[PDB]
């Protein structure tokens, strides 16, 4: 079996990724946590044989083949570099890095190391998004003209779960949600964004206010214009992703969550019908693709390059919102 | 009865406004058309006693009390000024004018003339939009956070209806659709937009291409961020208007057309339910309000000032799309 080591004893690894690794035929052999106590307790609760408290004891363990990183965002880049230096494959939760030169550097070093580097954008693995991508390529909507993304949800400010715990350094809806919208759009449209405009909302007067909502528009290389709406403050808005074309529209409802749910309708001259979907665990699909890539068959679902694309788009959106100006998206890949 | 004269022997006056005037207790006594033949034929077909071919014979007719203007956009400002000089009330199809100083001048001259000046933004008359406005003011969604407008429809390029007829000087989705979205948002939110960002699409390479789609964002004075999507090129997208708040969301579907149709759902902690609506002809409602205003009771549905607001927002959106920069919306009222 491919044996994984975890960097970050996280909620997402517990809820989704550990089970996904095992479902896809791998095994999770070790977990690294900055805290000895947290790592041991987490190892016992999730059936993992070993807990460590150094990154090097994780990535350097001869019996770890691959590393999954789900620590706080600012730790990703350096922990991925350590794994790559140890010659281990890396699946990294977004973001890869906090800036583009660091993200580009990762992709190059992984390539130079001969290891698989993946960004865990989960949504592009859903059968909903895959159906839309495939229907578009099959001409079922003629030429795509416009896209819409709805990702305005409710995330209580500060959690965790014991109360309103650790400092938790932000840092906003754009870098936490919009980047997933960007990657999913790139997947569905099979095309790249070239510029962004945006307006964002921060709580309380311009400050250390959490950026808690954003709306904007991406211009894609094809000419498609794609709007997005991401927030932490709206309880009663369902998520969605739509693509409107010259001969049809695809309407995805409830398709931007972590769970394998949601519908896609195709509307065209015949009327409306639901596309048939075989829903499957997004994370199971991501791990399977990663395992095939390690095997020298195929690529991760989202590559290091996709992660650089999502980071560049996010950074563009932050700048367009802050400056009021349209910003060109350039990856430096 | 209040007796109306028509300036423009138009599709909209035939389909909607003539019948609305009569339903609301007025009468249409004359029609002005630049063509004698068209005006006579139109008068006979629509049961109007008189056709003329000069604006002054229309506005100066002692038996016309009020004037409805639905000519080509560039004629509005000057024809409204003639009516106002003749001391007649004016209901003007959007736009009032092509620039802000001309729109502001109209409002002032109408006020100085002692006549009612209305802009015929039809949508704010619908029971759907009215229900949303009222539910918001009643606290049914807590504090509004975000709005979304969907107005991407199919309008064949060039019509008319005999084939692909007269030159028809454009001039785009922003000034033809976005301005109605703006006015409706102002009505529903009871608040003003203060800045815009946008990206627009023109057919064929940057040129004399028709601007045939736009997406953008308005920042409102309250802090609400409101996105819109308007187009001429999408056949299979339903229209809609939504408002998402801290304690609920209002979802309007099929509510941006001329017809008295559409639904509004309120989603909140109880679930989702349809708001009960008494649908009524939008134009009948607009005329009734105008007739009351002439009577010295109440105001037109949308005033001259609302028309200046819609024009300023439209002009901001054109500039933000052209320049890539956020533009502040200032009415000069
Ligand atoms: N709500 C969210 O957190 C969201 C997260 N993401 C993405 O998912 C990834 C992980 O997120 P998620 O699984 O939700 O995060 P968790 O809060 O479950 O874990 C993240 C990190 O916080 C630390 N931590 C966990 N529990 C405690 C505790 N009781 N006291 C102190 N520190 C603790 C852990 O440190 P250690 O590993 O050292 O034990 C862990 O690496 C991130 O990389 C992020 O990009 C995306 C959107 C929302
Ligand atoms: N599709 C549209 O036209 C849209 C219109 N609007 C708004 O509605 C208003 C009127 O629109 P609508 O009723 O659709 O326009 P119509 O095309 O029906 O009429 C507009 C003008 O075009 C002229 N016209 C009409 N028929 C002919 C013909 N056979 N040959 C030459 N000229 C002709 C008329 O001139 P005359 O009056 O001199 O007879 C008339 O004033 C406008 O002010 C605009 O702002 C808004 C969105 C879309």
XYZ file of C-alpha atoms and ligand atoms in Angstrom:
762
model
C 0.000 0.000 0.000
C 0.964 3.646 -0.419
C 1.570 4.891 3.101
C 0.722 8.439 4.034
C 1.989 10.687 6.698
C -0.145 13.564 7.883
C 1.224 17.004 8.577
C -1.536 18.622 10.693
C -3.863 16.741 13.006
C -6.813 18.506 11.428
C -10.593 18.462 11.195
C -10.478 17.930 7.468
C -8.089 14.898 7.771
C -10.424 13.420 10.410
C -13.723 14.133 8.628
C -12.595 13.336 5.093
C -9.016 12.535 4.156
C -8.020 9.618 6.463
C -11.048 7.595 5.386
C -10.474 8.552 1.766
C -6.884 7.384 1.852
C -7.962 4.017 3.298
C -10.917 3.703 0.856
C -8.501 4.223 -2.054
C -6.202 1.488 -0.816
C -3.577 3.454 1.056
C -2.872 3.604 4.776
C -2.132 6.448 7.134
C 0.891 5.460 9.178
C 1.863 8.598 11.038
C 0.638 12.061 12.071
C 2.678 15.122 12.902
C 1.218 17.701 15.284
C 3.061 20.607 16.917
C 1.666 19.243 20.192
C 2.665 15.791 21.530
C -0.537 15.449 23.464
C -2.837 16.470 20.616
C -0.958 14.190 18.125
C -1.133 11.103 20.402
C -4.805 11.603 21.211
C -5.523 12.169 17.507
C -3.524 9.104 16.507
C -5.463 6.887 18.999
C -8.837 8.321 17.984
C -8.239 7.826 14.244
C -6.435 4.473 14.298
C -2.967 5.809 13.282
C 0.040 3.800 14.544
C 2.360 6.722 15.175
C 2.367 10.345 16.332
C 5.318 12.700 15.979
C 6.020 16.337 16.725
C 8.609 17.215 14.124
C 8.083 17.675 10.372
C 11.369 15.943 9.721
C 10.341 12.845 11.689
C 7.245 12.747 9.506
C 8.673 13.344 6.074
C 11.925 11.439 6.878
C 10.181 8.298 8.119
C 11.299 5.573 5.678
C 7.871 4.021 5.788
C 5.994 7.181 4.606
C 5.584 7.381 0.813
C 3.362 10.477 0.593
C 2.449 13.440 2.750
C -0.915 15.225 3.217
C -0.618 18.782 4.573
C -3.571 20.439 6.254
C -1.911 22.766 8.806
C -2.535 26.508 9.130
C -2.070 28.224 5.760
C 1.203 29.969 6.453
C 2.925 26.580 7.266
C 2.106 24.913 3.868
C 4.934 26.159 1.707
C 7.780 25.240 4.081
C 6.330 21.879 5.129
C 5.830 20.968 1.421
C 9.457 21.926 0.755
C 10.632 19.630 3.557
C 8.595 16.683 2.118
C 9.971 17.356 -1.343
C 13.558 17.492 0.031
C 12.844 14.038 1.637
C 11.732 12.869 -1.803
C 8.077 12.360 -0.760
C 4.941 13.069 -2.813
C 2.823 15.903 -1.493
C -0.872 16.521 -1.504
C -1.317 19.967 -0.040
C -4.607 21.570 1.025
C -4.914 24.955 -0.519
C -2.997 27.190 -0.492
C 0.340 25.902 -1.675
C 1.936 29.157 -0.581
C 1.197 32.797 0.353
C 2.794 34.255 -2.742
C 3.395 33.354 -6.322
C 7.141 33.074 -6.368
C 6.917 30.504 -3.490
C 4.169 28.580 -5.301
C 6.134 28.511 -8.528
C 9.220 27.423 -6.611
C 7.325 24.420 -5.155
C 6.175 23.219 -8.528
C 9.739 23.413 -9.891
C 11.306 21.685 -6.867
C 8.728 18.878 -6.956
C 9.409 18.463 -10.632
C 13.202 18.455 -9.933
C 12.707 15.973 -7.039
C 10.720 13.593 -9.281
C 7.691 13.612 -6.866
C 3.966 14.155 -7.468
C 2.727 17.496 -6.119
C -1.047 17.968 -5.793
C -3.229 20.785 -4.546
C -6.313 19.445 -2.805
C -9.015 21.512 -4.509
C -11.798 19.047 -3.735
C -14.673 20.396 -5.801
C -13.299 19.483 -9.260
C -13.583 15.854 -8.132
C -17.398 16.014 -7.691
C -19.558 14.218 -10.206
C -21.597 17.431 -10.559
C -18.644 19.514 -11.795
C -17.350 16.651 -13.865
C -20.758 16.324 -15.601
C -20.763 20.015 -16.441
C -17.169 19.869 -17.793
C -18.084 16.857 -19.963
C -21.432 18.286 -21.152
C -19.638 21.531 -22.210
C -16.935 19.638 -24.136
C -19.685 17.578 -25.811
C -21.345 20.786 -27.166
C -24.491 20.462 -25.014
C -24.562 24.187 -24.390
C -23.045 25.436 -27.651
C -20.327 27.966 -26.879
C -20.049 28.995 -23.170
C -20.816 32.742 -22.689
C -21.126 33.295 -18.969
C -20.639 31.624 -15.624
C -21.981 32.215 -12.162
C -20.714 30.943 -8.841
C -22.647 31.042 -5.579
C -20.641 30.280 -2.501
C -22.179 32.537 0.130
C -22.491 30.371 3.263
C -22.510 30.687 7.030
C -19.251 30.148 8.891
C -19.452 31.318 12.513
C -16.544 33.717 13.173
C -13.958 31.714 15.220
C -13.958 27.854 15.381
C -12.561 25.247 16.329
C -15.298 24.153 18.821
C -14.455 24.427 22.555
C -15.634 28.081 22.403
C -13.992 31.056 20.581
C -10.479 29.639 20.927
C -7.037 30.381 19.410
C -6.022 33.738 17.829
C -6.658 32.257 14.315
C -5.001 34.708 11.885
C -7.935 35.308 9.493
C -7.603 35.900 6.643
C -10.648 36.150 4.572
C -13.241 34.925 2.241
C -11.190 35.556 -0.908
C -8.261 33.384 0.074
C -10.438 30.816 1.805
C -13.397 30.450 -0.653
C -12.844 32.388 -3.834
C -9.764 30.275 -4.700
C -11.888 27.121 -4.746
C -14.393 28.854 -6.999
C -11.511 29.792 -9.285
C -10.133 26.280 -9.519
C -13.607 24.786 -10.167
C -14.316 27.286 -12.912
C -10.956 26.471 -14.543
C -11.882 22.809 -14.447
C -15.431 23.207 -15.730
C -14.548 25.721 -18.457
C -11.197 24.050 -19.330
C -9.802 27.607 -19.620
C -7.888 30.219 -17.651
C -8.911 33.518 -16.106
C -7.041 36.537 -17.315
C -8.399 39.431 -15.215
C -10.441 40.202 -12.146
C -12.591 42.937 -10.731
C -14.130 42.770 -7.234
C -15.773 44.571 -4.330
C -15.355 43.129 -0.825
C -16.976 43.736 2.533
C -15.164 43.784 5.856
C -16.898 43.730 9.253
C -16.728 47.043 11.135
C -14.995 50.078 9.745
C -12.007 49.560 7.434
C -9.489 47.889 9.733
C -8.468 44.607 11.193
C -12.061 43.738 10.029
C -12.466 40.187 8.670
C -13.110 40.359 4.891
C -16.369 38.371 5.123
C -17.930 38.833 1.729
C -16.865 39.381 -1.822
C -18.403 39.667 -5.229
C -16.499 39.939 -8.425
C -15.977 39.008 -11.980
C -13.365 36.994 -13.770
C -12.732 37.461 -17.489
C -11.662 34.167 -19.028
C -9.328 33.711 -22.002
C -12.205 32.390 -24.187
C -14.188 35.614 -23.476
C -16.511 34.037 -20.906
C -17.321 36.350 -18.038
C -17.740 34.594 -14.739
C -19.202 36.116 -11.603
C -18.713 34.871 -8.096
C -20.220 35.576 -4.692
C -18.483 34.226 -1.593
C -19.303 34.973 2.006
C -19.207 33.780 5.590
C -22.301 35.773 6.671
C -25.295 34.367 4.756
C -27.219 31.490 6.265
C -29.965 31.015 3.779
C -28.242 31.032 0.398
C -27.721 27.658 -1.357
C -24.443 27.184 -3.245
C -24.391 26.830 -6.977
C -22.413 26.964 -10.189
C -23.903 27.697 -13.630
C -22.662 27.963 -17.106
C -24.758 29.704 -19.768
C -24.055 29.052 -23.409
C -25.265 29.789 -26.925
C -27.431 26.609 -27.129
C -28.049 25.715 -23.539
C -27.396 26.354 -19.853
C -26.056 24.116 -17.102
C -27.400 24.857 -13.603
C -25.628 23.274 -10.679
C -27.366 23.563 -7.298
C -25.868 22.647 -3.961
C -22.568 21.746 -5.599
C -19.932 23.871 -3.729
C -19.927 21.894 -0.443
C -17.522 19.212 0.669
C -20.177 16.521 0.411
C -21.026 14.344 -2.614
C -24.429 16.035 -3.203
C -26.041 18.466 -5.639
C -27.881 18.433 -8.966
C -27.183 19.621 -12.453
C -29.882 20.531 -14.866
C -29.402 21.116 -18.583
C -31.818 23.651 -20.073
C -32.033 23.824 -23.826
C -34.608 23.844 -26.650
C -36.058 20.492 -25.400
C -36.766 21.923 -21.972
C -35.044 21.143 -18.702
C -33.754 17.783 -17.512
C -31.562 16.556 -14.612
C -28.210 15.128 -15.729
C -27.702 11.633 -14.326
C -24.941 11.641 -11.695
C -23.083 8.920 -9.892
C -22.172 10.795 -6.752
C -18.912 9.809 -5.112
C -16.831 10.997 -2.200
C -14.772 13.942 -3.531
C -11.785 13.089 -1.369
C -11.851 9.400 -2.330
C -11.695 10.505 -5.943
C -8.801 12.916 -5.272
C -6.728 10.275 -3.472
C -7.354 7.708 -6.193
C -6.088 10.123 -8.800
C -3.047 10.946 -6.616
C -2.277 7.250 -6.125
C -2.463 6.676 -9.902
C -0.106 9.556 -10.477
C 2.443 8.112 -8.016
C 2.056 4.918 -10.059
C 3.021 6.822 -13.206
C -0.513 6.752 -14.598
C -2.169 10.117 -14.906
C -1.985 13.222 -12.907
C -3.447 14.427 -9.647
C -6.947 15.896 -9.969
C -5.508 19.311 -9.321
C -1.803 19.754 -9.835
C 0.773 22.079 -8.331
C 0.118 24.297 -11.376
C -3.629 24.445 -10.568
C -2.696 25.524 -7.121
C -0.486 28.307 -8.508
C -3.495 29.360 -10.709
C -5.862 29.492 -7.751
C -3.375 31.455 -5.633
C -2.733 33.970 -8.494
C -6.473 34.463 -9.003
C -7.027 34.917 -5.248
C -4.239 37.429 -5.018
C -5.657 39.340 -8.021
C -9.077 39.440 -6.434
C -7.644 40.734 -3.105
C -5.830 43.477 -5.025
C -8.843 44.414 -7.242
C -11.027 44.654 -4.136
C -8.425 46.745 -2.241
C -7.550 49.017 -5.126
C -10.746 49.263 -7.070
C -8.883 48.422 -10.274
C -9.017 45.472 -12.645
C -6.062 43.216 -12.136
C -4.436 40.956 -14.630
C -3.881 37.374 -13.469
C -0.387 36.125 -14.137
C 0.858 32.938 -12.793
C 4.642 33.297 -13.499
C 4.527 29.586 -14.450
C -60.468 61.722 -17.732
C -56.755 62.488 -17.904
C -55.960 62.565 -21.602
C -52.613 61.374 -22.851
C -50.678 62.145 -25.920
C -48.093 59.695 -27.161
C -44.712 60.736 -28.456
C -43.528 57.632 -30.372
C -45.812 55.163 -32.103
C -44.000 52.323 -30.381
C -44.200 48.614 -29.644
C -44.227 49.229 -25.929
C -47.150 51.757 -26.164
C -49.079 49.212 -28.264
C -48.299 46.123 -26.164
C -48.564 47.735 -22.737
C -49.055 51.448 -22.191
C -52.200 52.338 -24.227
C -54.209 49.609 -22.512
C -52.754 50.567 -19.149
C -53.744 54.187 -19.564
C -57.321 53.162 -20.421
C -57.454 50.563 -17.589
C -56.434 53.284 -15.113
C -59.192 55.586 -16.294
C -57.365 57.820 -18.728
C -57.676 58.043 -22.498
C -55.136 58.293 -25.271
C -56.236 61.094 -27.558
C -53.328 61.616 -29.908
C -50.098 60.045 -31.195
C -47.078 61.758 -32.665
C -44.912 59.844 -35.136
C -42.161 61.273 -37.350
C -44.015 59.572 -40.214
C -47.560 60.621 -41.231
C -48.313 57.232 -42.664
C -47.038 55.245 -39.687
C -48.872 57.567 -37.202
C -52.239 57.313 -39.031
C -52.032 53.544 -39.402
C -51.016 53.259 -35.736
C -53.819 55.566 -34.634
C -56.440 53.481 -36.549
C -55.052 50.173 -35.284
C -55.016 51.266 -31.624
C -58.254 53.267 -31.496
C -56.626 56.739 -31.125
C -58.634 59.691 -32.513
C -55.710 61.714 -33.807
C -52.277 61.338 -35.399
C -49.753 64.147 -35.738
C -46.217 64.507 -37.020
C -44.874 67.338 -34.916
C -43.948 67.257 -31.214
C -45.414 70.705 -30.794
C -48.792 69.647 -32.205
C -48.752 66.861 -29.635
C -47.636 68.665 -26.525
C -49.468 71.909 -27.508
C -52.828 70.235 -28.104
C -55.146 71.828 -25.512
C -56.866 68.524 -24.971
C -53.674 66.604 -23.955
C -52.993 66.660 -20.196
C -50.009 64.283 -20.073
C -47.407 62.914 -22.442
C -45.868 59.407 -22.679
C -42.512 59.296 -24.497
C -41.241 56.053 -25.965
C -39.193 57.223 -28.986
C -35.563 56.317 -29.690
C -33.395 57.085 -26.653
C -31.597 60.123 -27.987
C -34.975 61.950 -28.591
C -36.215 61.675 -24.933
C -34.555 64.663 -23.339
C -35.639 67.244 -25.935
C -39.177 65.899 -26.353
C -39.611 65.929 -22.527
C -38.396 69.539 -22.472
C -40.982 70.503 -25.096
C -43.809 68.862 -23.043
C -42.616 70.613 -19.907
C -42.486 73.983 -21.750
C -46.154 73.303 -22.802
C -46.910 72.711 -19.127
C -47.733 68.996 -19.603
C -46.913 66.101 -17.257
C -44.387 63.652 -18.629
C -43.957 59.954 -18.205
C -40.761 59.103 -20.017
C -39.478 55.606 -20.828
C -35.938 55.272 -19.693
C -33.634 57.019 -20.253
C -34.588 60.555 -19.372
C -31.431 61.782 -21.067
C -27.988 60.694 -22.342
C -26.056 62.566 -19.694
C -26.443 63.668 -16.141
C -26.530 67.401 -16.557
C -29.466 66.989 -19.036
C -31.266 64.622 -16.650
C -30.810 66.975 -13.729
C -31.988 69.863 -15.887
C -35.248 68.003 -16.692
C -36.046 67.366 -13.072
C -35.497 71.052 -12.229
C -37.532 72.339 -15.194
C -40.426 69.984 -14.413
C -40.316 71.146 -10.837
C -40.229 74.813 -12.027
C -43.094 74.126 -14.496
C -45.251 72.597 -11.730
C -45.702 69.295 -13.705
C -45.268 65.646 -12.687
C -42.202 64.030 -14.267
C -41.964 60.222 -14.146
C -39.448 57.720 -15.435
C -41.158 54.538 -16.570
C -39.019 51.940 -14.795
C -41.699 49.251 -14.878
C -40.232 46.574 -12.634
C -40.609 48.427 -9.302
C -44.365 48.245 -9.919
C -44.453 44.402 -9.866
C -46.004 42.697 -6.882
C -42.878 40.511 -6.667
C -40.506 43.452 -6.104
C -43.002 45.181 -3.881
C -43.263 42.045 -1.682
C -39.498 41.902 -1.317
C -39.286 45.639 -0.447
C -42.025 45.204 2.185
C -40.618 41.944 3.619
C -37.176 43.637 4.016
C -38.661 46.680 5.788
C -40.614 44.303 8.058
C -37.341 42.617 9.209
C -38.102 39.255 7.551
C -34.501 38.860 6.480
C -32.758 40.687 9.329
C -30.221 43.114 7.893
C -29.681 42.857 4.080
C -26.073 41.790 3.241
C -26.034 40.981 -0.446
C -28.108 41.154 -3.590
C -28.048 39.353 -6.890
C -29.686 40.277 -10.164
C -30.117 37.948 -13.127
C -31.180 39.599 -16.324
C -29.370 37.598 -18.989
C -31.946 37.041 -21.758
C -32.134 36.530 -25.499
C -32.753 39.558 -27.693
C -32.086 38.828 -31.374
C -29.655 41.466 -32.709
C -31.781 43.902 -34.814
C -35.624 44.137 -34.489
C -38.261 45.574 -35.281
C -39.810 42.625 -37.231
C -39.992 42.974 -41.049
C -36.413 41.584 -41.199
C -33.146 43.241 -39.998
C -34.421 46.769 -40.627
C -33.315 50.317 -39.685
C -29.732 51.298 -38.686
C -30.763 51.206 -34.960
C -27.932 52.988 -33.098
C -27.166 50.344 -30.432
C -26.186 50.990 -27.748
C -25.814 48.218 -25.339
C -26.845 46.024 -22.549
C -25.701 48.406 -19.805
C -27.838 51.327 -20.887
C -30.717 49.125 -21.979
C -30.899 46.528 -19.123
C -28.531 47.345 -16.311
C -30.356 50.642 -15.605
C -33.577 48.754 -14.883
C -31.686 46.441 -12.552
C -30.312 49.519 -10.805
C -33.689 51.145 -10.317
C -35.254 47.885 -9.032
C -32.450 47.362 -6.552
C -32.874 50.945 -5.293
C -36.558 50.259 -4.806
C -36.169 46.880 -3.123
C -33.276 47.929 -0.874
C -34.649 51.466 -0.251
C -31.020 52.648 -0.596
C -28.601 54.124 -3.113
C -25.590 52.699 -4.909
C -22.349 54.502 -4.346
C -19.830 52.704 -6.593
C -19.575 50.247 -9.435
C -17.161 47.761 -10.884
C -17.867 45.811 -14.098
C -16.550 43.702 -16.960
C -18.422 43.773 -20.281
C -18.346 41.707 -23.444
C -18.650 43.082 -26.957
C -19.240 40.944 -30.061
C -16.201 40.658 -32.349
C -12.927 42.346 -31.592
C -12.985 45.628 -29.651
C -14.820 47.943 -32.036
C -18.213 48.988 -33.197
C -19.096 45.634 -31.467
C -22.451 45.639 -29.632
C -21.811 45.462 -25.853
C -23.971 42.339 -25.400
C -23.141 41.187 -21.914
C -22.074 42.650 -18.632
C -21.415 41.535 -15.114
C -20.627 43.802 -12.258
C -21.052 44.825 -8.715
C -22.679 47.768 -7.050
C -21.693 48.830 -3.535
C -24.696 50.299 -1.752
C -24.637 53.012 0.919
C -25.798 50.525 3.615
C -22.798 48.260 2.775
C -24.815 45.742 0.754
C -22.945 44.428 -2.248
C -25.143 43.717 -5.216
C -24.124 41.777 -8.296
C -25.798 41.905 -11.654
C -25.626 39.940 -14.889
C -27.288 41.361 -17.997
C -27.066 40.050 -21.520
C -28.717 39.774 -24.908
C -27.041 36.445 -25.810
C -28.326 33.814 -23.354
C -31.470 31.911 -24.222
C -31.745 29.534 -21.354
C -31.195 31.662 -18.260
C -34.277 32.621 -16.182
C -34.334 36.133 -14.701
C -34.186 36.675 -10.994
C -33.530 39.026 -8.115
C -32.421 37.933 -4.626
C -31.636 39.580 -1.406
C -29.662 37.722 1.271
C -29.791 38.917 4.840
C -28.655 38.111 8.365
C -31.882 36.202 9.251
C -33.273 35.200 5.915
C -33.098 35.343 2.124
C -35.612 36.473 -0.479
C -35.409 34.656 -3.833
C -37.277 36.150 -6.745
C -37.525 33.987 -9.875
C -38.801 35.112 -13.240
C -39.312 38.643 -11.955
C -37.327 40.879 -14.409
C -39.719 40.603 -17.393
C -42.403 43.022 -18.470
C -45.164 40.604 -17.527
C -46.959 40.287 -14.168
C -45.375 36.879 -13.349
C -42.725 35.428 -11.044
C -42.407 34.025 -7.525
C -40.734 35.074 -4.337
C -39.647 32.643 -1.720
C -38.551 33.545 1.797
C -35.963 31.172 3.266
C -35.304 31.418 6.963
C -35.037 29.221 10.078
C -38.592 27.851 9.461
C -37.666 26.626 6.005
C -38.787 27.973 2.659
C -42.207 29.323 1.739
C -43.699 31.212 -1.250
C -44.798 34.764 -0.418
C -48.419 35.323 -1.427
C -48.624 37.725 -4.382
C -51.465 39.520 -6.060
C -49.981 39.904 -9.503
C -51.013 42.992 -11.425
C -50.121 44.608 -14.712
C -46.927 46.618 -14.046
C -47.911 49.362 -16.461
C -51.438 49.660 -15.045
C -49.858 50.194 -11.652
C -47.416 52.815 -12.997
C -50.167 54.817 -14.712
C -52.379 54.707 -11.632
C -49.580 56.127 -9.539
C -48.904 58.810 -12.193
C -52.591 59.755 -12.315
C -52.667 60.081 -8.504
C -49.624 62.296 -8.613
C -51.253 64.608 -11.190
C -54.163 64.691 -8.730
C -51.813 65.914 -6.002
C -51.872 62.594 -4.156
C -48.583 60.772 -4.054
C -45.765 60.498 -6.433
C -45.077 58.563 -9.595
C -43.752 55.042 -8.998
C -40.386 56.159 -10.253
C -39.697 59.861 -10.295
C -37.467 62.070 -12.406
C -34.900 61.656 -9.603
C -35.046 57.836 -9.919
C -34.389 58.256 -13.567
C -31.341 60.434 -12.845
C -30.155 57.660 -10.413
C -30.534 54.938 -13.024
C -28.749 57.005 -15.682
C -25.848 57.833 -13.270
C -25.477 54.162 -12.334
C -25.553 53.113 -16.010
C -22.959 55.678 -16.920
C -20.739 54.524 -14.018
C -21.020 50.933 -15.138
C -20.109 51.850 -18.763
C -17.050 53.704 -17.459
C -15.976 50.937 -14.997
C -16.259 48.371 -17.791
C -14.312 50.570 -20.261
C -11.637 51.648 -17.825
C -11.294 48.711 -15.520
C -11.609 51.011 -12.512
C -14.221 51.371 -9.794
C -16.376 54.382 -10.404
C -18.202 56.453 -7.884
C -21.875 57.094 -8.651
C -22.850 60.719 -8.302
C -26.122 61.994 -9.389
C -25.486 65.804 -9.242
C -29.039 66.055 -7.828
N -12.894 26.222 8.671
C -11.645 25.936 8.278
O -10.761 25.689 9.085
C -11.309 25.916 6.813
C -10.142 25.278 6.396
N -9.782 25.220 5.107
C -8.522 24.532 4.718
O -8.432 23.230 5.326
C -7.195 23.055 6.045
C -7.424 22.591 7.488
O -8.688 23.049 7.981
P -9.507 22.349 9.209
O -9.347 20.873 9.069
O -10.920 22.926 9.214
O -8.687 22.966 10.484
P -8.524 22.438 12.015
O -8.814 23.601 12.950
O -9.249 21.164 12.281
O -6.938 22.131 12.063
C -5.986 23.085 11.554
C -4.780 23.235 12.478
O -5.111 23.866 13.732
C -4.510 23.172 14.829
N -5.477 22.731 15.881
C -6.451 21.797 15.748
N -7.103 21.620 16.927
C -6.543 22.445 17.847
C -6.741 22.783 19.291
N -7.709 22.187 20.037
N -5.923 23.720 19.849
C -4.948 24.344 19.153
N -4.718 24.077 17.851
C -5.463 23.167 17.150
C -3.841 21.898 14.294
O -2.466 21.878 14.705
P -1.556 20.552 14.681
O -1.678 20.099 13.280
O -0.217 21.095 14.981
O -2.216 19.585 15.622
C -4.144 21.871 12.784
O -3.020 21.632 11.923
C -6.420 24.378 5.970
O -5.112 24.149 5.424
C -7.272 25.331 5.128
O -6.554 25.842 3.988
C -10.558 25.796 4.168
C -11.741 26.465 4.460
C -12.237 26.585 5.822
N -36.297 46.138 -27.829
C -36.465 47.443 -27.572
O -36.774 48.234 -28.452
C -36.275 47.960 -26.174
C -36.794 49.210 -25.839
N -36.662 49.731 -24.612
C -37.229 51.072 -24.311
O -38.595 51.172 -24.757
C -38.802 52.318 -25.606
C -39.464 51.942 -26.937
O -39.138 50.598 -27.311
P -40.035 49.680 -28.322
O -41.469 49.954 -28.022
O -39.534 48.242 -28.212
O -39.552 50.292 -29.762
P -40.270 50.296 -31.222
O -39.257 49.815 -32.249
O -41.602 49.630 -31.229
O -40.502 51.880 -31.442
C -39.444 52.823 -31.187
C -39.358 53.892 -32.275
O -38.916 53.366 -33.542
C -39.719 53.869 -34.614
N -40.343 52.809 -35.465
C -41.298 51.923 -35.088
N -41.662 51.142 -36.139
C -40.940 51.527 -37.220
C -40.806 51.128 -38.656
N -41.543 50.116 -39.187
N -39.912 51.805 -39.431
C -39.154 52.817 -38.954
N -39.235 53.225 -37.671
C -40.079 52.636 -36.769
C -40.876 54.683 -34.017
O -40.882 55.994 -34.602
P -42.147 56.985 -34.532
O -42.415 57.070 -33.082
O -41.583 58.238 -35.073
O -43.261 56.277 -35.249
C -40.717 54.574 -32.489
O -40.785 55.810 -31.762
C -37.444 53.008 -25.802
O -37.534 54.385 -25.410
C -36.431 52.206 -24.980
O -35.738 53.026 -24.018
C -36.006 49.042 -23.658
C -35.440 47.790 -23.872
C -35.527 47.121 -25.160
